[PDB]
Each structure stands twice: as C-alpha cells, then as structure tokens.
Design a protein around this ligand. Structure first.
Ligand code: HEM
Ligand code: HEM
Ligand SMILES: CCCCCCCCCCCC(=O)SCCNC(=O)CCNC(=O)[C@H](O)C(C)(C)COP(=O)(O)O
Ligand SMILES: [Zn+2]
Lengths: 50, 122, 50, 59, 45, 441, 464, 48, 54, 88, 82
C-alpha cells in the first residue's frame, strides 16, 4: 500500500505546522482568570458572610 | 528616572566619601584596610575570592589581622610614625570579589548554583 | 583499568576467583527463613497493602 | 494464529495453506457458492497486491 | 466537511433517547404536587 | 501519552526528508588557500560530511621553549579554552556544550594546535569560540594554579609508558637545537610554574606569520570573509632555534622496568619539505613493521623481541626515521644484534612482495589519517604550517611510484649516516658502545 | 562588548533545527538474497576507504549451559587458518590489501568486519566468506588457545568495568539467558572441542540472521553480485527455529538484587546501579537516550566539570565524589538496562551512591525545558558525529537491520528525537525509576557501600 | 548573607526559584494538616 | 548531605540512623530501649500527676 | 526595492530548484537551470501538472491553462516567472 | 516584511536571523514577539466580559436551575401569596 506518489504534498507544506504558526491555548481565554477571582472575591465580600 | 539617578549620584558620592573618610580614619588606628573587614566565615563569596589570591597577599592580610587583634587586646593604637603610613583604601580583594560575584550572578540566570558551599567545621 | 593492578587478587582457581572471572546467573540464596518468589515476578508489592 | 504444525510449514506452503483455508472459511460463511464467487475473486485479488513483497519483516 | 457514520449513529440514538425522554415527561406528576412533596421533604430538616 | 510509535514501524509521515537533497558536486573538492591582510594564512577543503572541523595551528611546542618556560606546551594543553576577555570559563563551557561541540588543545614538538569540532549548522559558533579562546585568552592566576595538579598526573601517567621516554631521549640525542627539547617533561619541571610563565611562552610563540587557520567542510570565501575581523593579530616573531642532526648515543636507568628497550634511528634528509624522501621514509617504516596486528588474537613469535615499534617523523627541514624494539633484560645484546641485522638486510635489498606490501600499508595509513573531518583538518593545517600547501595527492603518487631500487638506495644512504642509539631499563647486559655503532660502517 | 567576538553565540540553550543537514546525507540500499541474507550498502560520494563485514543476530544469549563460551572461543579460532588459505597465506593477503580484520562478540550480536581501501572490496568479501564458511577449526589450535585462556582466567585478567558489568548482568538477569557471561565458565573452556564449534556455527549462522553491511566507497550492484557468489551457500532457517521463537521460548527476567565482590587490599571501588530499562523496539527508548544524555558522564582529567550543564556531573566534579563515572543505556531484544556506573574509593562511595540515587529520582518530579533542549541538541550532534566515520555507518546499518528489522531514516530519527519534551521525560522516569526495584553491583574496596535496603529506600520521596 | 543579601545581590532570578509543580506539591500539604486536625478534634457536621 | 549542614542533624544521624551494630543481636539486646521508654513513660505520667498531687 | 513589479532571477531559480527536488524518483544532483522534465527528470504528465500547481502555490499564481501547457522544462517555468509582475 | 521567512534549498539560515527572537521549524523562521498595549487591553476586555457574565448569572441562577413556574410556585407555597 504505497502512498508516496506524485509530489507528496503533506511534506511540501509541513512547515505550516510551525509552533508559532499554531493556535495558542495560553491566551485563548485572556482575562478569564482575573474575572473569576474578582467574582469570587465579590461573592465572599457581599453575599456569603454578611 | 535616570535623571534622578544621576541626581542622587552626587549626593550618594558625597555620603560615600564622607563615610569612607570617617571609617578609614577609624580603620587606620588599627592598621586595617577596608578589605580586611570581609570575613570568609560570614561570606562564601569572600571565602572563594580569598582562595584566588597569591599566598604573599594572604600572608600580609593575616599579619595585619594579627597586628590589629593584638592592638585591640592591648587597648592601644599604632605609633604616629607608623600611623602616618597607613592607607586603608588600598584594594587587594575588590577585583577578585567582584569577578566572583559576577560569576555567581551569571550562573544564577541559567539555573546553576554556585560551585562552592559554605564553610563547615565539624 | 586492569583488575590485577587495581584489585590485586590472589592467583588460583579459588571459589571467589571463579565467580570473579565468570559470575553465574544461578544465584542460590538461603531459604531457611524466607522462600523466594519465582524470578522476574513483576508488580507493585503486596506488602504495602499489609 | 495458526497451529504449531502450520507454524513449521515453509513460507510458500504456509501462505498456500493460509489461502486455501481462507477460501474454505469463505465457503463456510457463504450463503451459496454463487455468493462465494465474487468473494473468491476479491480474495484472489487481495493476495495479488502482496505478490512483490520482499522485506521479510513486513511479510 | 467530514463524513462520520458515527455522527449518523449518534443522531439516531439521540432521536430514540429523546423520544423516550418525552414519554417520561408526559406522565410526570403535577408541578404543584411535586412542590408540595418537596416542601414536605424541606419541612423535615 | 507521548510518542507511542514502535520503531519497527515507520513513524508518521511528518518524519520525512521533504527538504530535498543538495546536488552532489561534479569532482572531488580541492584545497583552496589564501592569506589574510594581517598575514594569517587560511586554507580550507570542502567535504560532503555533516561535520565541520576548525583547527588553529601555531608554531611553537617544545621547540620554542626556554629553560625558564620549560613544560609550557603541556600546561597550555590543559589551560586552553578557559576565561577570555569577552567570556568567562562558565560561559565558554556552556556555549560549547549547548551545540554539542568538542574542543582540544594538542602540543607537538614544533607546533601547538587548538581545534573545535561541530556540526555543519554551527560553524560560525565554532569559529567564533575558537578565535576568542585563542586570541583573547586571559590565563588567570588561580586557574593555572589549579590546573597544574592535573598537568602533573597527566605527565606522570604519560611517562609510565617506556616508549614515550625512549622517544624523548631519542629526540634529545638525535638533535641539537629546538627539536632536542623535551616535550613530555618530568612532573617536577613544572613545580614552580605560574601564569606569567605561560603568558611569556604564549607571547613568544604568537605571531601573524606563524598562525594557520585550517577548516574542513567550510566554504572558503565565507570563512575568509568572516575570519578577517577575528584573526587580526599583532606581535613579533621570537627567534626559532633551528635544529641540526648530529647523532650519538645515550642511556636511561630505570629501576623497576620488567623489560629492556632499545631504540635505533637515522635522519630522514629533507624533512617534511621533500615529498619523495618522506614517502620513502614511510615505506621504510612499513618495511620495518614486523608484527602488525592485522587480525584478532594472532600470535606472531619472534626469537628475541617482545615488541617492535617503528616510526617516521618529518619535521621542518629534517626528520627522524627509525625503530624501537623491546626484549628480555638478559638478551639486550641479542636485541641490538637483531635490529642491526634487520636494517642491514633491508640495505641488502627488498624483494617485490615486501615492496608492494609496504606501499599498500603506507597508502592505507595515509588514506585512513584523512578519512574523518577532524583528521583531514589537522592534516591540512600541519601541512600548510610546515610547507605552505597540502599535497596528499602528491604524497599518494610518490608512494605509488616508488621502485625497489629507490628504496634500496634510500636505505644505503641512510646506513652511511651516523645513527642514534638509546637504551632503557635496569641495564645489566650491554655490548660496549664503540662496537654498537660499528655494524653499519 | 566586542563587536566581532560576541555575535552568533550565547549560553542560553535553545532548540536547533537539524533539517538542512538531511539534504546531503546518503541513502541506504537493501537487497535480500534468496538465501535470506540482506546486503545493505551506503555510498559516501568521495570516500577512499571502506568498512564492510557480516553482522549476525547471535551470541552468548543463544548458547546453552553446556557450551557457554563457544561464540567467544570462535573468534580465537576462526583467524587461525581456513581450508583454502593457511595462517601465513591469510596474513600476506590481508597485509597486501592494507587493512585489518576485526571481530566483536556480544550477548546478542556478533560482527566480523574489515576496514580496507576502496580497491579491495571484492578481496575483502572473498576473505570474509573464506573464514566464515571454510574454516579449519583445527584441534591443535584449539589446544593452543585453551591454555592461554585458562592462564588469563587463573590470573583474573579482566577490566574492572567489565567485571562489574558482568556481575550486574548476572544478578539482574538471574535464571534467564542474558545472565551468562560472553567468556563462559572455566569448565566449558577446559572441555571445549571442535564439535561444539561446528554445531554452534551450523545452528546459528544462517541466512535470515546475517547482514552483509558495507559503507564508504562501494557499489551496491557489485556487492550484490559478490555476495551472491560468495555467501550464496549459507543454509536457510527453519520457521520453528527462528530468532523470535528462541526469544519466546527462553524469555528475559529482571530480579531486584545486590552483589558485591570484596577484595582485601584493593584501592578503587567500582560500582554500578541499574534499573530495568527498555527493549530495542520500545518507543520509550528514545526518551531513555535523551535522559542518558541528560545524566552525561565525566572523568577527572577534565577541568571544566564544574561548568557542566548536567547537575550530576556538576555535583560529582565539585564535591570530588568519583574519579570517573558514566550513565549507560543498554538495550536488548526484550529488555534493557538504564543506570550509572562509576569509580570511587571507600570513603566517597556512599556519597556517590546518594548522588546517583538523588539525581535519578529527581527526573520524575522536576525537569526544566532548557536541559531537555540541550540534551536533544547534544544527542543529535552525537548522531551526526557517527556519520563521519564509515565504520560507525556500517555498524549502525548492521545493528539497525538486525534489531529493528529495517533501516530507520535520519529524518524519522530526528523527528522522533524532536518529539521528546519535559512531560515525556517525567513520564518515562515515572514509569522506569520511581518506586521500582533496582540492581546493584560493586567490586573492589566495597565495605562501605550501602546495602540493598538503603538503595531501595531512596527510589521514592516521602515529602511529596 | 543568607536571606535579604541573596536578593540584593541578584542571586534570586526567575530561575533557581521553585516551579509551579514544586509549589503545588508543597501546597498539597495544606489539605493534610486540615484533615489531620479534623481527625484529631472530630467536629462532625460543624460546618455552619 | 543535608545532615552535613547542621550539627544537630549530624549527631542524630551518626548516633541513631547510620550507627553500625552487630547483625546477630538477638532479643536479649532490647532491654536498653525498653528501659529508656519506661523512663520516658515514668517522667510523662509523673509530670501529669504532679498537677493534682499536694 | 528592485524590478518594475518583477523579482530577481536568482531567488526565482533557487525557489524553482527547491520545489523541484520533491520527488522520490528525483536524484538531487541532476536538477539544474533549464532542465528537461520528461527527458531529463523522468516525471510523467501527472507530475508536471502537480509541479505546475505546486509552483502556483509557492509563487501565489493562477497560471492560464495554455501557458501551463507550454510549461515542459525548468527553464521555461523560470522564464515565465521572470515575466510575471503578479508573483510573490 | 513577512513575519515568516522561507529559506528553500536547505540554505544556511542567516545568522542575524537566529536567536531567541527567531524560532525556526522546517527551515522556516518565525519570531517570538510580545505587544504590551494589545495584551493589556485584551486582558482588560476579557476580564470585563467574564465578570459581567459571572455576576449576571449568579444574580439569576435560581431562575435558571429551576423553572420560573417552579421557583414562583415554591415561593407562593412557602412564602405566602400576597
Ligand atoms: C535507665 C536505665 C538504663 C538505660 C536507659 C540503658 C540503656 C542502654 C542501651 C540502649 C544499651 C544498648 C543496647 C542494649 O544492650 O540494650 C545499653 C547497653 C548496656 N547497658 Fe544499659 N541501660 C540502663 C541501665 C543499665 C544498668 C543498670 C546496667 C548495669 C548495671 C547497664 C549496663 C549496660 C551494659 C554493660 C551495656 C552494654 C551491653 C552490650 O552492649 O553487650 N545498663 N544500655
Ligand atoms: C519527672 C519525673 C517524675 C515525677 C514528676 C513523679 C511524680 C510522682 C508523684 C507526684 C507521685 C505521687 C502520686 C501518686 O502517689 O500516685 C509519684 C509516685 C510514685 N513514683 Fe513518680 N514521678 C516521676 C518519676 C518516677 C520515676 C523515674 C520512678 C522510678 C521508679 C517513680 C516511682 C514512683 C513510685 C514508686 C511512686 C509511688 C506510687 C504509688 O504507690 O502510689 N517516679 N510520682
Ligand atoms: C470529484 C472527482 C470527479 C471524477 C474525476 C475523474 C475521475 C476518473 C479518473 C479515472 C479515469 C482516468 O484516469 S483517464 C485514463 C488515462 N489513462 C489512459 O488513457 C491510458 C494511458 N494513455 C496515455 O496516453 C498516457 O500514458 C497518459 C497516462 C494518458 C499520459 O501520461 P504521459 O503524458 O505522462 O505519458
Ligand atoms: Zn571471551
């Protein structure tokens, strides 16, 4: 079952998978953690104890 | 803020010179230099830098230390003819210790520790 | 380094010298107090559970 | 996996018995010989895709 | 796009499961009755 | 998990050599040489290997030592590739270990060599590290003081082999001048060594006309263009004590030597400068190869000898071809007699099969020396430093075009010249020295 | 800052892409004969020398208790005269082609090879086939080698590292074929003969277990023709007696154990600690290669050991714990060994042992990315250095066809190395090291080496 | 010269500091002392 | 290594952790540890009883 | 910059050569300026079409069908590119 | 120019185009770069949206988990009708 025939293209543009050419999950949801922390602090400050 | 940096610069230089003059006048009554105050037991960078010196310099430093300790035990000072020759700001340890500290700073930015430990006597 | 200049053994076919030149894979332990498991027995030991 | 006797067969004989028993099983799973014919042709063709294999590991 | 027979099987199974869920929903007790029963469960704490 | 692909199976398609092959060159690459405007000569040879080797050859070694700076080349072998004006020792070590490169310092009897070996992708880094560690080296006090101990055990271990000691005493006896100085000195010679001694030696040996940059697998135009600002050197050529062959004889007293070693040597006229004389000397070295270990566990038995070890050194203007043979302590005169008989039978003529065998042995040694990139770079650098050119093709042609009559004439001219004779061991049996140097006359 | 002396280079470890080095690397051609013997060449375009030889998937593992030592005795006997050439005829003919014959016999691999020039390929093929197929195996030469082996056995004439590693294989692989030494016991040498040598060569030196690998200056078609003329008469292999059936029939077993070889007046203290590693075909063998590079090695003739990237090398060099040490990664057909071997004395043996155990267990928890990038670059550079010598190219061709079943391309090897990251290193270290049994072997002045319970306790941390 | 002298000299970099995994493994000891105190005192169903 | 940095760790390690002891000691060599444990028990229970005795 | 909307000869040649070597049948040393596709490189019509499409991708070009049919060698393609003001 | 440079033909990658500022893959180099104002503003807006959603949801979680019918019938049964 050979597949390497006629200018295999996967390898030709394999450079497109450059790590900096990829989808970054580090900044996928920016500011979300700070928002969660602020929401937790607001809840504990207003609703929980008083 | 480099403006104010250079600004303290001369106030910092003035206080540094005044402090050095007063302490060196206190230092020269025992024959000590500024570099003689640094202790290998207190500082491992000084302990490593003192290991990098030629042995005659270490002999001279040990002689000055013993002379000062004898003077302190006697509650005396140097004679005036001997006191006039003292130069407490002459450097023998500063470049060696500076290079040791620069090496330790350069190793710490890559995660490496210092290749020397503290001194243990047990 | 050579073992004659470093370990400096006695010369001869003594019992220790035979195992030094060619150790055997059929090691016999003492089994009066503990019987061994079959060799190559895998898995995390049951003594942690005990 | 085959049996130990089949394991002892020559490569040519091993593959021959493999193909023969495969045809036997295809008859055994067949509704009819008439159903078995196209299955036989396909089974013959599949071996034809392996005729020129040389690397004994992949073989 | 993509052709997943797994997606087809999922669609059919979801159809069946949701039909069953609808049947389960059809015979439930009154919301008034449910609330009163829960308040009975809430009155014993 | 991570990769779970079995190595018997091919890994997935993105493990491809999609980057295509560079076309191979039409002919075998030639050595291209030039000179910088500072005067440093640069020679390089292109290879298809993925390893680039850069070596820096400086005239010096034991021939440039003085009684004050005695053993400085051996100290320079250890103290090299340490703190420079631009980098600390830690930074240079980490910069070598980051790209997987290796460094060496190697001191000959008339040169010192410094080299960095790396892959073809890090040739600029290797060149910059090598140039910075050679040109801008600091040689601090504490580092040399701490390296002196390891220098002492390396010399003490290298003097355990009796062939090294015999080679030292043979070079002392054969030459007067630079080549007679001792390379592998006693450990106690460097007991009073300091960094000032090494700095004095380095200041003596360093000069732009005494430095050669040799590279393997590096483009020449790129190498000259990027090494012009790095190898701009200044300095004066310290006078070289030119050596002359005089011959003679000596002795060594060794208290616990279980064997007894005898050295016999002659002068190869012309040195490394003459291609034909060096080729004939290599053929003579191969003709003296009695027990060459061409097969595992083969036991060639000699009546008297325990080991035979010939050599052929080719320095600038003069050489030293000869043979060192061991033997039992009570059979030293027999060792001398057998060595004289072997050289005399060589002078009586070589017979076709021996000539072809020795020519093939010399060709195999010559071609196996330059098989790898560091060996080829070292050969190019040494040949350019000694002569001004690399002539391995001419050396192979000289080896192949050698007749038996030429070799017989060469040995006949050798035995007329006064020889060099060195003994070794707890010498309790020896023929008298006057009759030792009579059998070739 | 110097302008020309400070560009291009910096001590910050960054990943390097070795893809442009693949454009000019040569290709391997493999041809399988009807005998079952594979002929594999790799032509270097302007090479003048050639390494060529025969690699065999056999050795000390596939012997029995009765003939243990036959394969090692074979390399004493095989070069002492054939049925077509005498000792002197072989010596003259090898001398005239300007090369040397050589032989290695492992636990699972054997090679006989020649390093010649390019004009002597056919002569080397003919000579190698002549020793391999038509040897005399004379009883007088057998008696002439038996006494020499018996003298060197009585003298205990052995390297210290080989002594320690043989003890390590014997105690880690108890009651399995890999626990035997290559040399064999004294009794088998004292009762060896020509019949056992003939039977071993007849059983194991067959077509599907033999690779003729040549590198340097060599044409593939001409080597195919020469191999079909010379090595065409080797017997084929029965399916019931293949290498895989023998591996299944007698499998390897790892046992956590301890041995020391104590001497009354020795100076050094050599010791090795190993864990059960990976086989050759395990995909975790590439991270074990990276981890072995991360541990590294050091000997005290170097003076830059305190500036090493490796933390174990730094600790041993700074505190002076050992005169020399090295980390090893041994791979076999169905098991492996991973660990550190070192040489010390009796006053520094416990601290060296603690440094080994603490650096091995540390890789399960904390691994930084700079160390992994550095080790990947060093391992790829080490692989490129083996491409420079045709002997290593031929050795790798023979080994890769014997143990992987195929020639792994350089692009696949670089891609498999580049897929290793810090999480993979932590996972592989957790699989192989953490809270596992180990094998400990020592020899020499070993009275202060800690026992097995001390080593077993330090394979895990109670603080996490 | 252990303490504030280490940070004045520049010896405390982003490197040589504990990692996030190290701090989490140390930070996992917070639950152990809580569970140990609750085991020792046993205030059952005391959470408001 | 960590017990090499503090004196109190070193003394405790030397005299409690890594102290060499004959391998063939039987259960007649347990009287000392038991006597020490009984002294500690007597001291603890006596200190506790002294808070209520007059 | 350079060129009235056109690029240099040299980078075009280098890009064409780099694209060309992406075939298993191809030995690298035989690819050179103005090289025959069929007679020299031994690539079929499917390979020529694939190479045309690949070069179209590399240079971002939409080549007309007739001009593509005219392409039968390396030099022809290079000179065609050397006529394009629309190639990147 | 292009943030990605392409080398082709296995050419030696330019030394000026290597370093921490350049990351290469398949011979093609991309730059590791950071923008201060962009990232700060992105974090601000994302945090604002997240907190908005979280607080609006927490004010109206009962009216979602149970139905309005269920919640208000529960209030009527438990907390009066008027
Ligand atoms: C509060 C009382 C004592 C304590 C805590 C104590 C503790 C110990 C300990 C821990 C040992 C080491 C191991 C052992 O032999 O059990 C020992 C050994 C010894 N003790 Fe005691 N001991 C006490 C009283 C005594 C008394 C009353 C005597 C004798 C009159 C005594 C004589 C010895 C001797 C001779 C040894 C050494 C025996 C040997 O090692 O073979 N001890 N003691
Ligand atoms: C710091 C250590 C100790 C303290 C503070 C202490 C304190 C006391 C006190 C307050 C009592 C009187 C309470 C009572 O009679 O129950 C008592 C009783 C006694 N103690 Fe201790 N004691 C100590 C250690 C010891 C030791 C080492 C011994 C060793 C034999 C000992 C033997 C006794 C005895 C025999 C009695 C009498 C118990 C009775 O018959 O009621 N005590 N102790
Ligand atoms: C969405 C998809 C829709 C359907 C798309 C069409 C799919 C059907 C394809 C199957 C039908 C065919 O292959 S069409 C049949 C094509 N093959 C032939 O006609 C026989 C060979 N004749 C020749 O002249 C040459 O070899 C030739 C190979 C043509 C030229 O190659 P070169 O010039 O190098 O020499
Ligand atoms: Zn052996």
């Amino acid at each position: 079952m050979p597949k390497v025939v006629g200018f295999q293209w996967e390898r030709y543009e394999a450079w497109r998978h450059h790590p900096l050419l990829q989808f970054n999950k580090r900044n996928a949801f920016p500011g979300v953690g700070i928002g969660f922390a602020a929401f937790l602090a607001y809840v504990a400050y207003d609703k929980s104890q008083p | 803020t480099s403006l104010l940096k250079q600004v303290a610069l001369p106030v910092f230089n003035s206080l540094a010179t005044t402090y050095r003059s007063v302490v060196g006048a206190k230092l020269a009554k025992y024959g000590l230099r500024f570099d003689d105050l640094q202790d290998p037991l207190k500082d491992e960078d000084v302990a490593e830098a003192l290991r990098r010196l030629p042995p005659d310099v270490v002999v001279a430093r040990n002689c000055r230390l013993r002379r000062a300790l004898d003077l302190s035990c006697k509650h005396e000072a140097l004679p005036k003819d001997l006191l006039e020759k003292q130069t407490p700001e002459l450097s023998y340890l500063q470049d060696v210790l500076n290079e040791v500290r620069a090496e330790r700073r350069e190793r710490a930015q890559l995660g490496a520790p210092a290749p020397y430990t503290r001194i243990y006597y047990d | 380094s050579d073992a004659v200049e470093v370990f400096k053994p006695e010369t001869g076919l003594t019992p220790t010298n035979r195992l030094s030149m060619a150790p055997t894979p059929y090691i016999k332990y003492d089994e009066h107090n503990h019987k061994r498991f079959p060799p190559g027995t895998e898995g995390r030991p049951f003594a942690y559970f005990v | 996996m085959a049996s130990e006797v089949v394991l002892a067969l020559p490569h040519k004989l091993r593959v021959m018995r493999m193909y023969r028993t495969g045809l036997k099983e295809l008859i055994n799973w067949s509704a009819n010989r008439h159903e078995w014919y196209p299955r036989a042709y396909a089974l013959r063709q599949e071996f034809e895709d392996s005729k020129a294999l040389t690397d004994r590991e992949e073989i | 796009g993509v052709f997943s027979r797994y997606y087809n099987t999922g669609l059919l199974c979801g159809v069946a499961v949701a039909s069953g869920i609808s049947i389960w929903w059809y015979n439930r007790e009154s919301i008034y009755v449910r609330v009163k029963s829960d308040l009975e469960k809430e009155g014993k704490t | 998990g991570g990769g779970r692909v079995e190595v018997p199976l091919s890994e997935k398609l993105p493990a491809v050599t999609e980057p295509p092959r560079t076309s191979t060159p039409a002919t075998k690459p030639i050595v291209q040489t030039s000179s910088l405007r500072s005067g440093v000569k640069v020679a390089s040879i292109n290879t298809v290997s993925p390893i680039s080797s850069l070596v820096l050859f400086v005239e010096g070694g034991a021939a440039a030592e003085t009684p004050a700076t005695a053993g400085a080349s051996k100290v320079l072998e250890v103290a090299a590739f340490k703190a420079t004006a631009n980098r600390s020792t830690f930074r240079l070590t980490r910069e070598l270990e980051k790209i997987g490169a290796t460094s060496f310092a190697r001191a000959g009897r008339d040169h010192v060599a410094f080299g960095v070996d790396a892959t073809r992708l890090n040739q600029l880094e290797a060149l910059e590290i090598l140039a910075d560690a050679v040109v801008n080296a600091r040689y601090t006090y504490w580092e040399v003081r701490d390296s002196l101990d390891a220098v002492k055990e390396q010399l003490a271990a290298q003097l355990r082999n009796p062939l090294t000691a015999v080679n030292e005493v043979l070079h002392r006896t054969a030459f007067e001048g630079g080549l007679g100085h001792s390379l592998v000195v006693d450990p106690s010679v460097v007991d009073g060594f300091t960094n000032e001694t090494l700095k004095e030696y380095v200041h003596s040996i360093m000069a732009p006309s005494r430095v050669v940059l040799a590279a393997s697998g590096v483009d020449h135009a790129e190498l000259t263009a990027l090494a012009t600002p790095l190898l701009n050197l200044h300095g004066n050529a310290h006078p070289a004590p030119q050596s002359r062959y005089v011959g003679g004889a000596m002795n060594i007293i060794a208290p616990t030597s279980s064997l007894t070693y005898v050295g016999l040597a002659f002068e190869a006229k012309g040195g490394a400068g003459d291609i034909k004389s060096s080729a004939a000397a290599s053929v003579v070295k191969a003709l003296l190869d009695e027990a060459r270990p061409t097969m595992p566990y083969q036991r060639k038995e000699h009546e008297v000898f325990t080991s035979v070890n010939p050599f052929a050194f080719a320095y600038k203007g003069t050489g030293l071809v000869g043979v060192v043979a061991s033997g039992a302590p009570g059979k030293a005169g027999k060792v001398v007699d057998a060595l004289t008989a072997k050289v005399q039978s060589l002078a009586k003529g070589v017979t076709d099969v021996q000539l072809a065998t020795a020519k093939n042995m010399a060709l195999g040694e010559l071609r196996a020396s330059v098989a790898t990139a560091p060996g080829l770079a070292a050969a190019v650098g040494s040949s350019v430093l000694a002569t001004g050119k690399f002539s391995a093709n001419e050396v192979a042609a000289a080896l192949s075009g050698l007749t038996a009559a030429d070799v017989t004439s060469y040995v006949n001219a050798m035995i007329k010249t006064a020889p060099t004779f060195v003994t070794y061991g707890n010498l309790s049996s020896l023929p008298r020295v006057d009759s030792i140097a009579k059998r070739f006359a | 800052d110097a302008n020309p002396f400070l560009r291009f280079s910096n001590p910050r470890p960054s990943p390097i892409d070795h893809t442009p080095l693949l454009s000019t690397l040569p290709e391997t051609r493999i041809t399988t004969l009807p005998n079952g013997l594979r002929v594999a060449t790799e032509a270097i375009p302007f090479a003048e020398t050639t390494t060529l030889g025969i690699w065999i998937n056999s050795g000390s593992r596939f012997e029995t208790d009765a003939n243990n030592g036959v394969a090692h005795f074979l390399e004493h006997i095989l070069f002492k005269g054939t049925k077509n050439r005498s000792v002197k005829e072989l010596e003259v003919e090898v001398e005239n082609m300007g090369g040397q014959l050589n032989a290695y016999t492992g636990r699972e691999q054997t090679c006989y090879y020649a390093k010649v020039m390019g004009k002597d390929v056919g002569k080397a093929v003919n000579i190698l086939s002549d020793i391999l197929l038509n040897s005399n195996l004379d009883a007088r030469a057998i008696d002439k080698e038996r006494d020499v082996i018996l003298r060197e056995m009585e003298e205990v004439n052995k390297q210290t590292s080989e002594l320690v590693f043989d003890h390590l294989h014997a105690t880690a692989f108890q009651y399995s074929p890999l626990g035997r030494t290559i040399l064999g016991p004294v009794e088998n040498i004292k009762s060896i003969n020509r019949d056992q040598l003939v039977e071993y060569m007849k059983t194991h030196y067959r077509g599907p277990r033999m690779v003729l690998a040549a590198a340097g200056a060599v044409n593939h078609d001409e080597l195919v023709k020469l191999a079909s003329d010379a090595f065409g008469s080797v017997p084929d292999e029965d399916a019931a007696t293949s290498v895989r059936s023998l591996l299944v029939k007698e499998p390897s077993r790892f046992t956590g154990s301890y041995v020391h070889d104590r001497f009354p007046d020795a100076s050094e203290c050599c010791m090795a600690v190993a864990f059960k590693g990976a086989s050759w075909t395990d995909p975790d063998s590439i991270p074990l290669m990276v981890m072995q590079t991360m541990l590294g090695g050091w000997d005290k003739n170097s003076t830059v050991g305190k500036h090493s990237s490796s933390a174990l090398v730094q600790t041993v060099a700074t505190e002076g714990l050992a005169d020399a040490f090295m980390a090893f990664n041994t791979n076999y057909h169905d098991t492996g060994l991973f660990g550190v071997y070192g040489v010390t004395d009796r006053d520094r043996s416990e601290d060296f042992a603690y440094a080994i155990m603490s650096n091995l267990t540390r890789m399960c928890f904390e691994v930084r990315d700079a160390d992994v990038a550095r080790a990947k670059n060093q391992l790829k550079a080490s692989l490129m250095f083996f491409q420079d010598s045709t002997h290593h190219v031929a050795e790798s061709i023979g080994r890769e066809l014997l143990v992987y079943g195929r020639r792994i391309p350089k692009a696949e090897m670089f891609a498999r190395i580049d897929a290793v990251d810090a999480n993979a290193i932590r996972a592989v270290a957790d699989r192989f090291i953490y809270d596992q049994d180990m094998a400990v072997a020592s020899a020499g002045d070993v009275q202060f080496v800690p026992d097995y319970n001390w080593f077993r306790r330090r394979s895990y941390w109670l603080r996490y | 010269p252990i303490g504030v002298w280490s940070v004045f000299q520049g010896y405390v970099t982003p490197a040589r500091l504990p990692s996030i995994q190290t701090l989490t493994r140390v930070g996992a000891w917070g639950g152990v002392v809580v569970v140990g105190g609750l085991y020792m005192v046993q205030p059952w169903d005391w959470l408001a | 290594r960590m017990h090499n940095k503090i004196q109190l760790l070193s003394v405790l390690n030397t005299h409690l952790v890594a102290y060499p002891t004959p391998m063939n000691l039987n259960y007649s060599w347990n009287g000392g540890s038991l006597a020490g444990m009984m002294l500690a028990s007597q001291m603890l229970t006596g200190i506790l009883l002294a808070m209520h005795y007059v | 910059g350079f060129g009235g909307g056109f690029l240099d000869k040299d980078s075009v040649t280098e890009r064409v050569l780099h694209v060309t070597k992406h075939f298993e049948k191809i030995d690298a040393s035989k690819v050179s300026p103005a090289a025959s596709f069929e007679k020299d490189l031994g690539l079929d019509s499917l390979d020529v079409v694939e190479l045309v499409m690949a070069l179209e991708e590399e240079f971002g070009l939409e080549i007309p069908d007739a001009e593509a049919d005219k392409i039968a060698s390396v030099g022809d393609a290079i000179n065609y590119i050397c006529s394009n003001p629309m190639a990147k | 120019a292009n943030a990605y440079h392409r080398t082709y033909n296995g050419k030696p990658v330019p030394p000026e185009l290597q370093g921490a500022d350049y990351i290469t893959y398949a011979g093609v180099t991309m730059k590791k770069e950071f923008h201060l104002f962009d990232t700060v503003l992105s974090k601000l807006i994302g945090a604002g949206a997240t907190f908005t959603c979280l607080y609006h949801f927490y004010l109206n979680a009962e009216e979602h988990w149970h139905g309005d019918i269920y919640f208000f019938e529960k209030d009527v049964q438990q907390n009066g009708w008027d």
